[PDB]
Amino acid sequence: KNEVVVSFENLLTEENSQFIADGTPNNQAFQETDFKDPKNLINFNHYYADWGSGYSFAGFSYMNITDNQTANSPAPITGKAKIGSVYIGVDSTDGEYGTPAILTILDTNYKLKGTWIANSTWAYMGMIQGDGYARAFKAGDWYKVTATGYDEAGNETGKAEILLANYKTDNDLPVKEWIWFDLTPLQNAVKVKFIPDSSDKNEYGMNTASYFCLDGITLIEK
Ligand SMILES: [Cl-]
Ligand code: NA
To answer: What is the CA(86)–ligand 2 centre distance, in A?
Structure first.
């Protein structure tokens, strides 16, 4: 069964750049658009706005941003992509005003094999020292990403999970590397939703940044 790695290389011309929607960002609400990879394998949804501090995204975004020092950076804590220079930034929430990151496989001969995943700098900084809204992690805290698969009609096909932090003691740290997230348990999913969660949460949702990163998204033939 042939494997293909989705790539957004050769799309960004400048350093420290990201996908920018065709529409006009506003400070009222997120607007939604989509982008597909150059091989027309997967459609990724993308939310965008500008609340007054510059372009703000949710859902998926391809970028080459390397800043792993600024407290609110969407860049992986590694400060670099797993493969090449381009990776995918994800800001995903579920619920009422939720902006979930849901990809759709377009070349339906393929299913997802998996992906590399890493913590965003924003989520990592929140866990190691807090960020006002988020509090520093201690024994018992965790950070998770759950992938839910669906068929074309939207019927659930399977679910997979991975931890990006799991503090057994006050002295532990979140995952600082790219790690492999096996997505074959989603079965023949066409649509895949990625939702982050944290032990640092309340009634309104999670306090740790709902930002994480993906790279080397791999498809395998069914
Ligand atoms: Cl648009
Ligand atoms: Na990459």
So the answer is: 4
Of 2.60.120.1350, 3.30.450.40, 2.60.120.10, 3.40.50.150, the CATH number of 1-222 is 2.60.120.1350
Dump the DSSP string for 91-115: E---STT---EEEEESSTTEEEEEE
Residues 6+ apart with CB under 8 A from 132: none
Domain ranges in the chain are 1-222
DSSP secondary structure, the chain, as one string: --EEE---TTS--SSS-B---SS---SS--EEEEEE-TTS-EEEEEEEEESSSSEEEEEEEEE-----SSTT--SBTTSS-SSSS-EEEEE---STT---EEEEESSTTEEEEEEEEEEBHHHHHHHHH--SSS----TT-EEEEEEEEE-TTS-EEEEEEEEEEE-SSTT-----S-EEEE-GGGTT-SEEEEEEEESSEETTEESS-SEEEEEEEEEEE-
Q: What is the resolution of this structure in A?
A: 2.0
Q: Who contacts 135 (Cβ-Cβ below 8 Å, separation ≥6)? A: 126, 200, 207
204 C-alpha to ligand 2 centroid (Å): 33
Ligand 2 mean position, distance from CA 74 (Å): 15
Q: Ligand 2 mean position to 208 CA, how many Å?
A: 25
Please report which ligand is nearest the Cα atom of 85: 2
